Amino acid sequence: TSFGSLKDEDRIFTNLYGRHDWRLKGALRRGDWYKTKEILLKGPDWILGEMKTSGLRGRGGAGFPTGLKWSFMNKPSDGRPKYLVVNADEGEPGTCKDREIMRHDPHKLVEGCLVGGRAMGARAAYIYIRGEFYNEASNLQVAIREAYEAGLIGKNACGSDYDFDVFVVRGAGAYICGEETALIESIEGKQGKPRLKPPFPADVGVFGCPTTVANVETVAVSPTICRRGGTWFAGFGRERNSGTKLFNISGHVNHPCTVEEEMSVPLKELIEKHAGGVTGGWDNLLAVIPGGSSTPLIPKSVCETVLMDFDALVQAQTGLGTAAVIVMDRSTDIVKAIARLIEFYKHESCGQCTPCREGVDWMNKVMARFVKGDARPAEIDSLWEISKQIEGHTICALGDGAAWPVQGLIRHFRPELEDRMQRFAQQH
Partner 1 sequence: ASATRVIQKLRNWASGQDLQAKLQLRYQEIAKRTQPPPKLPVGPSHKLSNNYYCTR
Ligand X SMILES: Cc1cc2nc3c(=O)[nH]c(=O)nc-3n(C[C@H](O)[C@H](O)[C@H](O)COP(=O)(O)O)c2cc1C
Residue numbers at the binding site for ligand X (CB under 6 A): 58-61, 64, 87, 89-92, 98, 176, 178-180, 213-215, 218, 396-398
Residue spans of alpha helices (H) in 105-196: 106-119, 134-150, 182-188
CB of 292 to ligand X, least distance (A): 9
Distance CA 273, CA 198 (A): 45
Answer yes or no whether residue 183 interacts with ligand SF4 by CB under 6 A.
no
CB of 216 to ligand SF4, least distance (A): 22
| Residue 373 is labelled as binding a ligand | no
Among 218, 222, 322, 394, binds ligand SF4 (CB under 6 A): 394
Give 272 or 381: the residue with its C-beta nearer to partner 1: 381
Answer yes or no whether residue 374 interacts with partner 1 by CB under 8 A.
no
Within 13 A of 44's CA, how many CA atoms are on the CB side? 16
How many residues belong to the chain?
428
Distance CA 380, CA 173 (A): 34
Distance CA 308, CA 89 (A): 24
| Residue 230 is labelled as binding a ligand | no
Among 38, 45, 385, 419, binds partner 1 (CB under 8 A): 385
| Residue 364 is labelled as binding a ligand | no
CB of 354 to ligand SF4, least distance (A): 8
Answer yes or no whether residue 196 interacts with partner 1 by CB under 8 A.
no
Residues after which a C–N gap over 2.5 Å breaks the chain: none
Partner from partner 1, ligand X, ligand SF4, none binding residue 259, C-beta < 5-8 Å depending on class:
none
CB of 98 to ligand SF4, least distance (A): 21
- Under 8 Å CB-to-CB from 345, ≥6 apart: which residues? 293, 360, 398, 401, 402
Partner from ligand SF4, partner 1, ligand X, none binding residue 166, C-beta < 5-8 Å depending on class:
none
As beta bridge partners, residue 37 has none
Give me the sheet containing 124-129, strands edge to edge: 165-170, 124-129, 83-87, 211-214
Answer yes or no whether residue 379 interacts with partner 1 by CB under 8 A.
yes
Answer yes or no whether residue 281 interacts with ligand SF4 by CB under 6 A.
no
Distance CA 316, CA 298 (A): 8
DSSP state of 154: B
Q: 3-class SS at 173?
A: coil
In single-letter form, the type of residue at position 109 comes to L
* CA angle (393, 386, 306) in 5-degree steps: 85
Distance CA 369, CA 253 (A): 29
Give 5 or 382: the residue with its C-beta nearer to partner 1: 382
Answer yes or no whether residue 349 interacts with ligand SF4 by CB under 6 A.
yes
CB of 406 to ligand SF4, least distance (A): 15
Partner from ligand SF4, partner 1, ligand X, none binding residue 349, C-beta < 5-8 Å depending on class:
ligand SF4
Binding residues for FMN: 170-218
> Using CB under 8 A as the criterion, which residues of the chain lie in contact with partner 1 when the complex forms?
378-379, 381-382, 384-385
> Using CB under 6 A as the criterion, which residues of the chain lie in contact with ligand SF4 when the complex forms?
176, 194, 349-353, 356-357, 394-396, 398-399
